[PDB]
Structure formats: structure tokens, C-alpha cells
């Protein structure tokens, strides 16, 4: 139940985006200039972080965020495009960096003069490196026919892309949307645009295996960063939690229960095998032997002893059981659902229903496990009593 309300991640590489967004760090807004080409095993995206400065949204959005969590950092490979014969700078009033500044690693391809023809440049790039390439591009919806005719000229606008696994076509709707793509090695990612195309400048490449965070607390590197949640870091050997069912990382199993206590000691009666409450009526305090014991009382040599021979074997059995169960699994959960920007309602209802049923079965497994292990410990300690008696 107890959590540390800081992102305590000493010893492994960490990036605090803050105002930066993780969908930002591909695009390069003014809030991600120092995190444009980051490289770490952690991403901390905050609630206040906006991924774009110009208004707009990502199409196929949560899946792209789930890819960029699993990146290990980004190695931006400089895509070799030049765009000869057209204007490149398209800085808008919405983004502020030393005045007018657009995205650093894309380009608003705009005509040289207003109300003029847009040459139909059909760009192409090949992934020479033996790694999948994250290719991004953006489409600027005009918002009106006047802005379309002023910027990209009159007439209908048709922009298409093309790959071996992606030949899906676009049209502007008379306010920039970005659309990602997986580019295989030895494959070509051919664009074809007639204006209203935020052309990319550099290609995104994954580095390793990062596991990201969505929270609001600050970063304070002092711990080992095993498991995380939306308000800090929870690190323990305990197999179950109660704080948040959306914990991402090497995280314990969420339960509906408040706190399930495993009876790691034996049945106690203060002042199920047979005679736990039999001729040996009640437990007696004057004995120091552990979670078992053989207290002594005499008539000529009165004093308390301890039968360490079976007791230490019993403690080794209980501690081996403890190290078996408190051993946490190696499974790595990911951040499927989002708490800052909500997912689509139907898929989110499926996700909540699946997650609630998973917590039902894990809570019932935890309750039944605690119950059977309590019965196992009591029956075991009664069995060492019985074998001592015989």
C-alpha cells in the first residue's frame, strides 16, 4: 500500500520531458529542442506536456505512443531530402522559438509566392540500415478555401504515400494531422504530394528497450526503478498492490482487496492436523526459538530449552516458501490505456472490462493463495508438533 511519490530511478538513464511531449520528440516543437534526439531507457511524459504547438492531433495515436515508449531513445537519421525549387521555411505564429519557428525536423513545404502552382514533387527514401524506420509526415488541413488558394494554390489537392506495405491515399479537408509508418529495411517510403504536406527532414530510428511513465510527480534519482505508476514509484518484493491497476513496469498484481496478510507464522492462542488446541492447550510466552518451538518445564531441573533440530528445518521450510512466493514474476506489462488523453470509448470499455476481470481473477487467486498457505502453515506446524510427540 505504501508508495514513494517521486520517480526514483538512480542507476538507469532517465529523460524528463516536462512541457515536452513524446509525440513531440519526433516532430520537434519548441518545447522539445533539447529532447529532439534523446537516448535513454526512461521517458517521463507529464500532464502539462503538449506534443504540438500548432493545433492538431495524431491519427493512429495511442499505438504510436506505445511504440515510442518501447524505443530505448531515438537516433534521428538525417533523411536526405532537399526540396529543390520550392520554399522550405513555413514558420507559423502558433509556435514561439526566437520569434517565428516551425518544427525543427519537419518542413512546411510552401510555394515561393502566394496563389501560384505547386510542383508535384514525389519524394522517396530507402532504409539502407538493417532496422525498421519510423517515418513521419504531416498534412496541413487548410480550414478554408482562401488559405488553401493562398498557400498551396487553387484546385484540388491530392497527396499520396507509397511503400511495399502501405499504399494508402490522402486528401486535405478545407489543423495539421500527423501519420506514422513502419518502414522495413531495403524498402522505399515514396511520398507524392501536391501541396498541403508537412514534409519530414530526418527519419526516426529506434535504439533499444525503454519503458515509459505517465505521471505528474518530479524525478528524484535515488532508488532502483523497478515498477512505476501514475503518481510515483512503487518498489517492493511484495507480489500484490492496491494503488493503481495501470502500473507500468515490473509491477505487482492489482487486487480489489485492501491488504491481504499472509500468516507467515503459526496458529497462536494467547492466554488442522490434531491437537493444535488439544492436550497442548495454549501457547506459552517463555520461549525464544522462532516460528516454532519446544519450551521446557521440569520438576528437578526447571528451565526452558529449545529443540533446534526440527525447529531450524521448519524455519528453513517457511522461509523457502516465503522466498518462493515473494519471488515476483518476470513479466513486463506495458501502458495500454492512457489517462491524459482518453482512448476511443469502445476499445476503452473493452480494456476496462478485460482489466477488471483480470483483477477479479488475480484478487481471487491472491485470497485463495493466502488462505491455502495459511492452512498449509498451520497444518505443517501441527505436523512438526505431532512428529516431535511420536
Amino acid at each position, epitope marked *: 500500500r505504501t508508495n514513494i511519490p517521486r520517480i526514483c530511478s538512480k542507476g538507469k538513464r532517465t529523460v524528463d520531458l516536462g512541457q515536452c511531449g513524446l509525440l513531440g520528440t519526433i516532430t520537434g516543437p519548441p518545447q522539445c529542442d533539447q529532447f529532439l534526439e534523446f537516448s535513454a531507457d526512461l521517458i517521463i511524459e507529464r500532464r502539462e506536456g503538449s506534443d504540438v504547438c500548432y493545433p492538431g492531433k495524431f491519427v493512429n495515436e495511442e499505438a504510436l505512443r506505445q511504440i515510442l515508449r518501447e524505443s530505448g531513445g531515438i537516433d534521428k537519421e*538525417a533523411m*536526405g531530402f532537399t*526540396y*529543390s525549387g520550392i520554399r522550405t521555411n513555413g514558420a507559423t505564429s502558433s509556435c514561439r522559438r526566437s520569434g517565428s519557428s516551425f518544427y525543427a525536423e519537419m518542413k512546411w513545404l510552401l510555394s515561393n509566392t502566394d496563389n501560384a502552382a505547386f*510542383p508535384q514533387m*514525389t519524394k522517396s527514401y530507402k532504409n539502407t540500415r538493417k532496422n525498421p524506420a519510423l517515418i513521419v509526415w504531416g498534412i496541413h488541413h487548410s480550414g478554408s478555401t482562401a488559405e488553401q488558394t493562398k498557400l498551396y494554390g487553387s484546385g484540388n489537392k491530392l497527396v499520396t504515400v507509397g511503400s511495399s506495405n502501405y499504399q494508402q491515399s490522402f486528401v486535405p479537408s478545407p489543423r495539421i494531422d500527423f501519420h506514422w509508418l513502419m518502414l522495413n529495411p531495403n524498402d522505399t517510403v*515514396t511520398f507524392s504530394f501536391n501541396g498541403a504536406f508537412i514534409a519530414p527532414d530526418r527519419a526516426s530510428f529506434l535504439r533499444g528497450k525503454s519503458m515509459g511513465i505517465q505521471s505528474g510527480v518530479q524525478v528524484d534519482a535515488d532508488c532502483e526503478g523497478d515498477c512505476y505508476y501514475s503518481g510515483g514509484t512503487i518498489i517492493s518484493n511484495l507480489p500484490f498492490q492496491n494503488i493503481d491497476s495501470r502500473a507500468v513496469g515490473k509491477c505487482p498484481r492489482y487486487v480489489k482487496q485492501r491488504s491481504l496478510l499472509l500468516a507467515t507464522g503459526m496458529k497462536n492462542v494467547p492466554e488442522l492436523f490434531g491437537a493444535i488446541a488439544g492436550f497442548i492447550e495454549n501457547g506459552w510466552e517463555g520461549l525464544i526459538d522462532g516460528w516454532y518451538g519446544f519450551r521446557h518445564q521440569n520438576a528437578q531441573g526447571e528451565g526452558t530449552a529449545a529443540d533446534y533440530k526440527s525447529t531450524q528445518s521448519a524455519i528453513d521450510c517457511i522461509t523457502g516458501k516465503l522466498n518462493r512466493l515473494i519471488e515476483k514474476t518476470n513479466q513486463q506489462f506495458e501502458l495500454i490505456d492512457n489517462e491524459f488523453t482518453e482512448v476511443e470509448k469502445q476499445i476503452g470499455n473493452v480494456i476496462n472490462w478485460t482489466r477488471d476481470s483480470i483483477t477479479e481473477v488475480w484478487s481471487y487467486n491472491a485470497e485463495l493463495l493466502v488462505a491455502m498457505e495459511n492452512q498449509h502453515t498451520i497444518d505443517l506446524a501441527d505436523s512438526e508438533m505431532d512428529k516431535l510427540y511420536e
Partner: antibody, heavy 119, light 111 residues
Framework: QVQLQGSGPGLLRPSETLSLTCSVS????????WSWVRQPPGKALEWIGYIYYSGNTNYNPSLESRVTISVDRSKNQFSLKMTSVTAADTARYFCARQGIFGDYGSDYWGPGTLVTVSS | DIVMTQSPLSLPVTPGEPASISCRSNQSLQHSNGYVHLDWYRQKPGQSPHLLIY???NRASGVPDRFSGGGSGTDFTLKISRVEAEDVGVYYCMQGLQTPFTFGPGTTVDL
């Protein structure tokens, strides 16, 4: 819009190792991958081979053992070194980038570095 | 190695006339994207050449409208609407589908 510029020895005796250099602006050998070509005296233009900005090279099968291209990433120039120079290697080396590799912007052929074998 | 065949050899063209030069390959030129990898550079005698047509049959950036070489399959034909003073040039047909990037014998156009 990049600007290409070439330089190197002109009067060169045969058999020894040839030197060449070529300076570029703008792209700075940081994004697109360039290449070298060879034009024998008023003959058929040939393609020496391309070099990735990363460094991976791919020369023309016709001549491969006698040709090596310098990456030179830090400096804003890429050089060419040809071994076993011959009267056949007499040529007008051009330094450039091409359409078909992925950039669709002209070629920016650099100035001809005319070479001779003399004696 | 793809031998690129240029047709014809020379054009003693008269001023103001449509001039068309073709270039056939023994291998059909068609990139996976569907945009044929073929170019139409033109070398000014004793100087650095200039690309006139790119990606099979597409008007090149900063290139006069007269030049609009088309073609299909393995045989592509650069065409010019009129003949002018700057027209003089040894035209080369670049492929680009595979490596080697072969050119052409050239077309010595003149008045």
C-alpha cells in the same frame, strides 16, 4: 541548394597512387550519400560508385580493386583515391550526387578535375 | 551491368522544331513504387552536365517546359517542343533501377 567544388593533381605519372579531393557546402555530408563518376577524354561517361554518408561503399563492378572513395565526414569535403593509374585512367573526374538514390534535386555536378598520365 | 541503348545518334535540327530522342534498355525499368527510375541529363560540351527530366517522365525542377520526355516499359523518349540556341548538348539517358548507374553514348544535337 548545395554547391560542389573539386580539386587535385593534374600532371601525374602512371602506376602510382592518385590523390583527389572535393569540397561541398550545405548538406555537409550529414544527410544524403554522394558518389563519384569518370569521363575518359570525350568517351562514354562511367559511374565509379556511391558512398553512404555513414560509410558503406558500392563501386561499379567494372573497376573495383583500383578505386577507393574517402568518407571524410568531419570535414565538409569527400576525396577520391585511385590506385594503378593508367593512360586509360586519363579522364575528367566529376564530383556529384544523382537522382534515383532518393533525392530528386538536379545533380550539382562539381567542376571537372581533368587528369593526365604524361610520361 | 545493364547496357543502355540510345536512339538515334545525332540531330542536326533546324531552329524552332519538335526534337525527340529515345533510349531503350535490355531490362524494363520500373521501381517497386511504380515510378520508373530513369533520367535525361544533358552535358554542355566541355563542362558540367544538367538533369533535364527525372523519375522516368516528370518535368524536372528548374527545367524549361519544352523538355517533357515520356516513354514506357523499357523504351523512354525525351521530347522537346522547340529548338533554341541552348539546345546544343550531348544528352545522356541515366537508368538508376540497379547498380551500375549506366548512362548513354550521348546525342550530339546541333543546328
Amino acid at each position: 541548394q548545395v554547391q560542389l567544388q573539386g580539386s587535385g593533381p593534374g600532371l601525374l605519372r602512371p602506376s602510382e597512387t592518385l590523390s583527389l579531393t572535393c569540397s561541398v557546402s550545405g548538406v555537409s555530408i550529414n544527410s544524403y550519400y554522394w558518389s563519384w563518376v569518370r569521363q575518359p577524354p570525350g568517351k562514354a561517361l562511367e559511374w565509379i560508385g556511391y558512398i553512404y554518408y555513414s560509410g558503406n561503399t558500392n563501386y561499379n563492378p567494372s573497376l573495383e580493386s583500383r578505386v577507393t572513395i574517402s568518407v571524410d565526414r568531419s570535414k565538409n569535403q569527400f576525396s577520391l583515391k585511385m590506385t594503378s593509374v593508367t593512360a586509360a585512367d586519363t579522364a575528367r573526374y566529376f564530383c556529384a550526387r544523382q537522382g534515383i538514390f532518393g533525392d530528386y534535386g538536379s545533380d550539382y555536378w562539381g567542376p571537372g578535375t581533368l587528369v593526365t598520365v604524361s610520361s | 551491368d545493364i547496357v543502355m541503348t540510345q536512339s538515334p545518334l545525332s540531330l542536326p535540327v533546324t531552329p524552332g522544331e519538335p526534337a525527340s530522342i529515345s533510349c531503350r534498355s535490355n531490362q524494363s525499368l520500373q521501381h517497386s513504387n511504380g515510378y520508373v527510375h530513369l533520367d535525361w541529363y544533358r552535358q554542355k560540351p566541355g563542362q558540367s552536365p544538367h538533369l533535364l527530366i527525372y523519375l522516368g517522365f516528370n518535368r524536372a525542377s528548374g527545367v524549361p517546359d519544352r523538355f517533357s520526355g515520356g516513354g514506357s516499359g523499357t523504351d523512354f523518349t525525351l521530347k522537346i517542343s522547340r529548338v533554341e540556341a541552348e539546345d546544343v548538348g550531348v544528352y545522356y539517358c541515366m537508368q538508376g533501377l540497379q547498380t551500375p548507374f549506366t548512362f548513354g553514348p550521348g546525342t550530339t544535337v546541333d543546328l
